[PDB]
Design an enzyme around this catalytic site. Sequence first.
Site, PDB file in Angstrom:
ATOM      1  N   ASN B   7     -14.448   7.970  -5.392  1.00 27.40           N
ATOM      2  CA  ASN B   7     -13.534   7.598  -6.458  1.00 27.40           C
ATOM      3  C   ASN B   7     -13.797   8.535  -7.630  1.00 27.40           C
ATOM      4  O   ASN B   7     -14.680   8.285  -8.443  1.00 27.40           O
ATOM      5  CB  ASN B   7     -13.777   6.146  -6.872  1.00 27.40           C
ATOM      6  CG  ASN B   7     -12.722   5.630  -7.831  1.00 27.40           C
ATOM      7  OD1 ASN B   7     -11.523   5.654  -7.532  1.00 27.40           O
ATOM      8  ND2 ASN B   7     -13.166   5.147  -8.991  1.00 27.40           N
ATOM      9  N   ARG B  91      -8.891   6.969  -2.853  1.00 21.63           N
ATOM     10  CA  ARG B  91      -7.664   6.247  -3.177  1.00 21.63           C
ATOM     11  C   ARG B  91      -6.858   6.893  -4.283  1.00 21.63           C
ATOM     12  O   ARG B  91      -7.404   7.372  -5.274  1.00 21.63           O
ATOM     13  CB  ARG B  91      -7.954   4.806  -3.587  1.00 21.63           C
ATOM     14  CG  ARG B  91      -6.679   4.024  -3.885  1.00 21.63           C
ATOM     15  CD  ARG B  91      -6.932   2.622  -4.414  1.00 21.63           C
ATOM     16  NE  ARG B  91      -7.558   2.605  -5.731  1.00 21.63           N
ATOM     17  CZ  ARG B  91      -7.436   1.602  -6.596  1.00 21.63           C
ATOM     18  NH1 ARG B  91      -6.703   0.546  -6.279  1.00 21.63           N
ATOM     19  NH2 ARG B  91      -8.052   1.651  -7.772  1.00 21.63           N
ATOM     20  N   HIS B 180      -1.056  -1.980  -5.927  1.00 18.04           N
ATOM     21  CA  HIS B 180      -2.140  -2.875  -5.506  1.00 18.04           C
ATOM     22  C   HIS B 180      -2.077  -3.105  -4.000  1.00 18.04           C
ATOM     23  O   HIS B 180      -2.651  -4.058  -3.469  1.00 18.04           O
ATOM     24  CB  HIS B 180      -2.040  -4.206  -6.257  1.00 18.04           C
ATOM     25  CG  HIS B 180      -2.303  -4.088  -7.724  1.00 18.04           C
ATOM     26  ND1 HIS B 180      -1.781  -4.971  -8.643  1.00 18.04           N
ATOM     27  CD2 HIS B 180      -3.054  -3.212  -8.430  1.00 18.04           C
ATOM     28  CE1 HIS B 180      -2.196  -4.647  -9.854  1.00 18.04           C
ATOM     29  NE2 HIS B 180      -2.971  -3.583  -9.754  1.00 18.04           N
ATOM     30  N   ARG B 241       0.757  -5.360 -20.706  1.00 17.60           N
ATOM     31  CA  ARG B 241       2.128  -5.113 -20.271  1.00 17.60           C
ATOM     32  C   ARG B 241       3.037  -6.330 -20.454  1.00 17.60           C
ATOM     33  O   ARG B 241       2.620  -7.460 -20.228  1.00 17.60           O
ATOM     34  CB  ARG B 241       2.132  -4.702 -18.796  1.00 17.60           C
ATOM     35  CG  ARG B 241       1.267  -3.490 -18.433  1.00 17.60           C
ATOM     36  CD  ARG B 241       2.011  -2.708 -17.346  1.00 17.60           C
ATOM     37  NE  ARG B 241       1.289  -1.556 -16.824  1.00 17.60           N
ATOM     38  CZ  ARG B 241       0.239  -1.637 -16.017  1.00 17.60           C
ATOM     39  NH1 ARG B 241      -0.222  -2.823 -15.638  1.00 17.60           N
ATOM     40  NH2 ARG B 241      -0.335  -0.530 -15.565  1.00 17.60           N
ATOM     41  N   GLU B 384     -12.392  -3.447  -2.833  1.00 21.46           N
ATOM     42  CA  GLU B 384     -11.652  -2.186  -2.858  1.00 21.46           C
ATOM     43  C   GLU B 384     -12.163  -1.059  -1.963  1.00 21.46           C
ATOM     44  O   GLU B 384     -11.381  -0.403  -1.271  1.00 21.46           O
ATOM     45  CB  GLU B 384     -11.553  -1.678  -4.295  1.00 21.46           C
ATOM     46  CG  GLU B 384     -10.422  -0.709  -4.501  1.00 21.46           C
ATOM     47  CD  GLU B 384      -9.114  -1.258  -3.954  1.00 21.46           C
ATOM     48  OE1 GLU B 384      -8.631  -2.285  -4.482  1.00 21.46           O
ATOM     49  OE2 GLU B 384      -8.574  -0.662  -2.995  1.00 21.46           O
TER      50      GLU B 384
END
Lengths: 399, 398
Positions: B7, B91, B180, B241, B384
């Site tokens: 990552n 990812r 997601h 958001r 994850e």
Amino acid sequence: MKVLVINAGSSSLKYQLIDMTNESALAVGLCERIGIDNSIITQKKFDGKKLEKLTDLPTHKDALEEVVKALTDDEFGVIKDMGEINAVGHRVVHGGEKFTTSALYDEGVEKAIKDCFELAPLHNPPNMMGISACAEIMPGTPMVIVFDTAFHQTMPPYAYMYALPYDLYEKHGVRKYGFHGTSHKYVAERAALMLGKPAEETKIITCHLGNGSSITAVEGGKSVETSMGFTPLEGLAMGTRCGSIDPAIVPFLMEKEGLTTREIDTLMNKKSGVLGVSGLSNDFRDLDEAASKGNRKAELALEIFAYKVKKFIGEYSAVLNGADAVVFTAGIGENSASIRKRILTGLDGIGIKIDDEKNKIRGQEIDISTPDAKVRVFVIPTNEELAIARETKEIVETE
Amino acid sequence: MKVLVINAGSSSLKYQLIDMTNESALAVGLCERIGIDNSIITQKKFDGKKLEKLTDLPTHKDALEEVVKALTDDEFGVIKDMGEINAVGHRVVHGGEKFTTSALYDEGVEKAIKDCFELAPLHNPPNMMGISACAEIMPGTPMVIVFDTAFHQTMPPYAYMYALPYDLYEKHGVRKYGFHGTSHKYVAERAALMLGKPAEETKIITCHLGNGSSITAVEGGKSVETSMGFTPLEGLAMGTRCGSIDPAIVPFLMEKEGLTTREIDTLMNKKSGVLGVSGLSNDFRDLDEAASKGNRKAELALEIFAYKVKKFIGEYSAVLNGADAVVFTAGIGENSASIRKRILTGLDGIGIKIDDEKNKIRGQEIDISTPDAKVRVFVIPTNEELAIARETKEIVET
Ligand SMILES: Nc1ncnc2c1ncn2[C@@H]1O[C@H](COP(=O)(O)OP(=O)(O)O)[C@@H](O)[C@H]1O
Ligand SMILES: Nc1ncnc2c1ncn2[C@@H]1O[C@H](COP(=O)(O)O)[C@@H](O)[C@H]1O
Ligand SMILES: [N+]
């Protein structure tokens, strides 16, 4: 008392004279292509007699004169002189923060309507025109205004509030409003009646589907949530309206196409919806036929429309912790059996089941769901005119 | 199989070595202070052994060549030679179109990743600095790129298309992509096991509740609908958001406040959400406190958030024509028995009920619903790295 209810659009004008004594609709007419070529006005008397007059209608004013002429037609009319029109009810979509309850017309009310032109670009300007035509033809007649937002005023903060900076709600009164209220309230009472239970005890999902469409979650006879918001653009996809899309698309589309705020607004309000997807038209009847003849675009357009209505139905089932019935009204909701089927298929898991055959019936108030279905499904023709005439009758009398 | 999940970051590099046989993390590290001073690499070995080496890390490529030294350390490592690392998975949040599945990095797969910059209004473009490293440090080894939007490429047209002019989708790619993906898929797989049936015969509503939140309708193990869309902005109200609001508000705000396109986007993505409402914090845990302490704006922000999520549960109940289970994952979803309560209360009408006592448990796969409830409500922590490990494996097999 007799009341002329008015419904104005950019180039159309739906009118209706109702005798408040026995609440009978003496006459129902429509003026189309106001401002275009081949202007026309059609009228239907209670006895069925129909009138049609091909006459150029430049403004809403000229049409309102032809309206009075049709109403006083010696044989196809229902009255003798304009004076028999005791009052005039008007449909107004957005009244703003300040005006959210029917009110006798005055300079102040006229101010709030114009001020809200930006909040309902497709409706207020036209409603206002009807109001003006009215004042130029029957100045002596009392006028009452009925707002589309009225019925939704009982929504809770956690529903009408947007997840934006709080000051926006204070600095600009930016909150959810909702529309088609007068219609959602009428058909909701009708459902409660067909349920046999008192309004306060029923939980209903009313569906108004016409040029514009919106769903409302009515609990105990009061709007608790609705598909439209600050303006009549939010929510479901419609004739030319996009509904709830990713907002980030606005700034995006603005940068990519270098569009102005004004243009992106006209694009979302006049060029999207089924019109935008089909590339054919905003008329669902046309789309229905075109889709059945092989037009993939028209098919895709109605596919998006029914699916969106379906999701809202599930969305309000959670809100009401179980709905007693789902109601379909308005142009599409009352007449379209095909679109209705598209919307209700695959919902037996949430108690909705329907009789494909009983669902083919025309314009009739009827339960179109299987007798064993946990959730009732009524097809209830709307009658805003009566709702407006009723409101107009009260205001004018109660001083 | 042994997968190395990486990552990349600004000046950091997080990694994990997982044995796919037992899906056990043999080692986990992090290279901090990359391309600067005080460069450091910290590795943790399963059997409680931690290594901290202060070697300098100029370019990420070295930060990865050091991850090799550490993974192969005589006492603190977990493998003899770099050859035990069968594959490497990284990812990338934005996968857009094209990538309907994870792609085995090469020359082509890199183009579409670079191409999708101005063709999308995302804020954090692919930090390829991590992938680039593998390109050399590890030549003959499958390097998989897992996209967080791929999982939703199973959505039908009437769902991913917007009721906007068709030309926009055809010439600008405007459609619903969703995010997601890896998390929703991971928890959706876990849910099927908990239901005791093949994924194919299960209909699940997955809820990823974190700083950013989204809901996905899972039908027979495949995504058919999701809350986010063209961007991570659409959907629920989140930490900062606003989510799906009336589109008319955007041009309106830009007019009243005299804002620029880039400005209005910042207001909706970073100045809105629970932060904008409460005017206190974008952190739910802090808002949960303030709330119970009588803070109105705080309470209001939690009601809006939970309410929205609820609306989505019923919305997806219609999409899936009845759900078998609802899953709650991510930070808020795994540790907040407070919000989960706000969300699930008042839903017995659609077959959802929860056991208050079982809902008190934090981080752990468990069915918090009541035994009489028709819809199972599971609490499944999302992993994850293992999710990207599973994904990387499958692409390496076929
Ligand atoms: N039989 C029908 N089939 C398909 N669509 C219909 C039908 N009847 C009405 N509609 C839809 O309703 C629209 C207008 O309804 P609405 O907005 O309620 O206005 P009005 O009822 O005054 O005509 C039509 O343009 C069409 O899209
Ligand atoms: N125990 C908790 N209660 C409430 N909110 C929490 C708790 N633990 C984490 N959170 C929130 O959940 C989110 C998790 O973020 P992420 O790990 O990025 O999904 C953060 O915004 C935290 O504020
Ligand atoms: N993101």
